[PDB]
Amino acid sequence: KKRYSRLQLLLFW
Amino acid sequence: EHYIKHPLQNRWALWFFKNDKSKTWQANLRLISKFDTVEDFWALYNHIQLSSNLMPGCDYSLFKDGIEPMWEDEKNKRGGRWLITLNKQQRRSDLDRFWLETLLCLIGESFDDYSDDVCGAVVNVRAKGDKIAIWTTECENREAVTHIGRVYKERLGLPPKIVIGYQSHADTATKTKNRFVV
Ligand SMILES: CN1CN([C@@H]2O[C@H](COP(=O)(O)OP(=O)(O)OP(=O)(O)O)[C@@H](O)[C@H]2O)c2nc(N)[nH]c(=O)c21
């Protein structure tokens, strides 16, 4: 269920 | 919701290797940390050296918690790796960005239906040329292995003309041919 896009991961930095 | 951390599908373990404790390979492994949220990943990433600033002979490995970063693990012994081989100049231009993209592929569950086949990834900092690899659990699952390779190549932004290879760990450990190519 838990999938993150590249975009999403970088935003969370 | 703001106050909730963003959980990862898997808990991950980051390992460090440097050949300065033992003449046996595995006794040079150090567990650095484990994490299971996006926020905790970045906190760890922010604290540790870039791969390009490590001494030659060092490795980082990121593996699903419960899988040791070695051939002998039950989940690696029948498996293999997609190998990215870097030239010396790519330490500067590509190593750090390729490693980070690899980490994001893993923690984000970026291999859709075949994400469970992924075990981990390893970066080797070496004087002869650095290597990055994604380790998968079963070298005979053509469909899973090829899909993972194609995702990985696309996420690193490598053109069709650049070909990468997959080697089984059994072959790598024997005194290497590609099983697959993408
Ligand atoms: C990943 N490794 C690496 N390794 C030992 O470390 C040696 C070097 O492997 P490496 O660090 O993957 O590659 P590298 O240093 O570039 O050398 P090479 O030219 O063999 O690729 C291996 O030949 C082996 O003796 C291992 N030994 C055991 N028992 N299990 C493992 O999973 C591994």
Numbering used by the authors:
A (entry chain B): 2 to 14
B (entry chain A): 32 to 206, 211 to 217
Article passage:
The eukaryotic translation initiation factor 4E (eIF4E) protein is a vital component of the cap-dependent mechanism for mRNA translation. It binds the 7-methylguanosine (m7G) cap structure present at the 5′ end of mRNA molecules and recruits it as part of the eIF4F assembly which also includes two other partner proteins, eIF4A and eIF4G, to the translational machinery for protein synthesis. We have used a structure-guided approach to rationally develop a set of hydrocarbon stapled-peptides with high binding affinities and residence times against the oncogenic eukaryotic translation initiation factor 4E (eIF4E) protein. Crystal structures of these peptides in complex with eIF4E show that they form specific interactions with a region on the protein-binding interface of eIF4E which is distinct from the other well-established canonical interactions.
The lifetime of binding measured in terms of the residence time (RT = 1/koff) was also found to be higher for the 13mer peptides (∼36 seconds) compared to their 12mer counterparts (10 seconds for sTIP-05 and 6 seconds for sTIP-06). Crystal structures of the complexes of sTIP-07 and sTIP-08 with eIF4E were determined (C and Table S1†). The essential interactions made by the parent 12mer peptides were retained. More significantly, the added tryptophan (W13) in the sTIP-07 structure was observed to indeed efficiently interact with and engage the patch on eIF4E. W13 formed pi-stacking interactions with W73 and Y76 and hydrophobic interactions with L131. In addition, the amide nitrogen of the side-chain of W13 was also observed to form hydrogen-bond interaction with the side-chain of N77. Hence, the additional specific interactions formed by the residues at the extended C-terminus (W13 and &13) for sTIP-07/sTIP-08 respectively could create a greater barrier and hence result in the lower association rates observed for these peptides as compared to sTIP-05/sTIP-06.
